[PDB]
Amino acid sequence: RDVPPADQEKLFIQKLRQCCVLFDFVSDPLSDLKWKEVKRAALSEMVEYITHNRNVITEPIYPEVVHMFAVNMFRTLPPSSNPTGAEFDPEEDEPTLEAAWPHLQLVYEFFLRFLESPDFQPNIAKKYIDQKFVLQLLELFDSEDPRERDFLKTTLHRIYGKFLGLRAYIRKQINNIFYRFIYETEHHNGIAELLEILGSIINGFALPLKEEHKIFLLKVLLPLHKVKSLSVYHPQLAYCVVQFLEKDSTLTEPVVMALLKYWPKTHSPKEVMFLNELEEILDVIEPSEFVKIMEPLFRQLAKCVSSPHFQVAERALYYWNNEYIMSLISDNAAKILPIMFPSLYRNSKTHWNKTIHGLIYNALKLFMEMNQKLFD
Amino acid sequence: XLXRXXX
């Protein structure tokens, strides 16, 4: 770690320092004990030492690195400083930062660079990068320090891609977290970061999309749409959801239906989201499959148009503003019969917000000015 | 701070 005491009798010290830099300073929320600067400076040099010198990560430091990381990182996480319930909005506010980050920032940074070395042999590392290692690393995504997860995101995302062995276990493990989440703990503050990973993972699926993953989309991902705090992680979810439909279009019927069953009443910002990703899906829809949901969709869709809540009504009616979506509709006449009455009783007067009032007009115009000149 | 329509 000094890169100064010849070539050998150097691996002898690095291992010495990452035992040295492993008697962690259990208190950073109570006073000072500096001359634990040594630790900091030393794991800084170790982070330098592995990102500048060729052939330094030899077989006997893997164990000693993972030990160093595990001793440093696998805490019991603390009682989240902000009190919570159903009352407070999940825009979770008091963002209590990890006290001892000035060491952790580096522990992560190093171990990540370790994982990233051009000569990080993973066949050697797997021996020491346990499932139980993955497991701990995982219940850490629950940290309320946004920096913390940001590291874990990339860290795990490396561990994932690097260890084919781990991949099965990893997936199943971050499935249980979600199952804990959606079916009645409704808490965990890392669904976002985990979704980001899974984002890439889905995108890397294969030849005839494998069964386990189809389950994963239906049993796990869609049900995520049904939790109180969809906001905090909607865009990422939205990605994962559309991702499947790119690779395998035959999934559209179940994933569109799911949404309509999970369609929100008594919570509007989500109803907007549900439309917002619903259109996101249509932009990728194959005409073949459009029919299978054409009706059940525009049935619900039409309720939104009327629904007093302007934000919903606008987003709902703003489908008629995008050429492809509009093509499919006016490629049908079965489409404009469920959407006949809801844009008539709520058409002449009503909807205090005069923006969705000219929008509903341009909607009927673009519908009547189609092939089927139909009236009632 | 919660949003400036308004803490």
Partner: protein, 306 residues
């Protein structure tokens, strides 16, 4: 009035946090829709009163407010507006305060706030609260109509000007406000809007509001708006200050804020301004009420139809 015995029965009920029904509200809002359209843009208010500001749905705190400055018949009131939004119990707050109008029709007085609008009401709390507490956008529909009738401002003892927001460059004489048509949803531009959307500041002249709309106004604007109009004091809410009440513009304008620290999860004391018989001001600074069954409903919450 054999209906007035049912009314203080309604009030007796919802003073324990429990709400009123679908039809109970529809006719409560109707009987208050008519007892209100009688009042004027500026509403001349009799002298002894307690002036309250934003309560934003913080019901159990509105109760703490009453524990602080007397119960609703026995001590006269006057609210600024903003009853319905950021808190948890909007439905129970705006339904209590309206009931306390149509019953004790002179013992309280309720003004309109920026939040007593269709657009804000559904881009914040209220509308979705009505939606999970009734199953239909009907109690919301009724309350948003009664909102239109709420008077835009008030005038205690011809001297202290009570309005929700603040001053406007489209008003001049007090009489200008009187000439407005407020029987409509609050617009994005215009006197009405400014009246109940703007704030004072340390800037001088009219300025641009960091809020969507309204105007900022310096101590020069209100001073001169005072010295030629009536002019003891301007009283407003709508803009939180941690003291609960805040005194600004060489004591030309006070801001009274009446909802404390919870989902006003900032950290403010709330306050009310008591105007006595001769018309001197005292200010009572209350903290939020202690709560119970605390932050845990034991996590057995209902869904949202899903």
């Amino acid at each position: 009035k054999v209906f007035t015995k049912e009314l203080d029965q309604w009030i007796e009920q919802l003073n324990e946090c429990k709400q009123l029904s679908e039809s109970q509200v529809k006719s409560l809002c109707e009987k208050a829709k008519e007892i209100l359209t009688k009042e004027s843009n500026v509403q001349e208010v009799r002298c002894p009163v307690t002036v309250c500001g934003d309560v934003h749905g913080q019901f159990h705190d509105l109760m703490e407010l009453f524990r602080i400055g007397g119960k609703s018949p026995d001590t006269n009131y006057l609210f600024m507006g903003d009853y319905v939004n950021r808190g948890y119990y909007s439905v129970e707050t705006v339904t209590l305060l309206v009931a306390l109008k149509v019953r004790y029709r002179e013992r309280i007085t309720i003004l309109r706030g920026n939040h007593e609008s269709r657009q804000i009401t559904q881009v914040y709390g209220f509308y979705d609260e009505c939606l999970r507490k009734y199953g239909n956008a009907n109690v919301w529909k009724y309350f948003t109509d009664l909102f239109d009738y709420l008077p835009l401002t008030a005038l205690v003892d011809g001297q202290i000007f009570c309005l929700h927001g603040g001053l406007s460059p489209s008003i001049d004489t007090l009489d200008h406000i009187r000439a407005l048509d407020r029987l409509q949803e609050v617009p994005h531009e215009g006197p009405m809007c400014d009246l109940l959307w703007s704030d004072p500041d340390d800037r001088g002249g009219w300025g641009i509001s960091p809020r969507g709309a309204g105007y900022t106004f310096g101590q020069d604007i209100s001073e001169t708006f005072n010295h030629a109009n009536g002019l003891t004091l301007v009283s407003r809410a709508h803009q939180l200050v941690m003291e609960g009440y805040n005194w600004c513009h060489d004591r030309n304008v006070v801001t009274i804020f009446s909802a404390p620290n919870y989902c006003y999860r900032c950290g403010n004391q709330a306050a009310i301004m008591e105007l006595d018989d001769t018309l001197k001001y005292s200010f009572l600074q209350f903290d939020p009420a202690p709560r119970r069954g605390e932050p845990h409903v034991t996590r057995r919450t209902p869904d949202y139809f899903l």
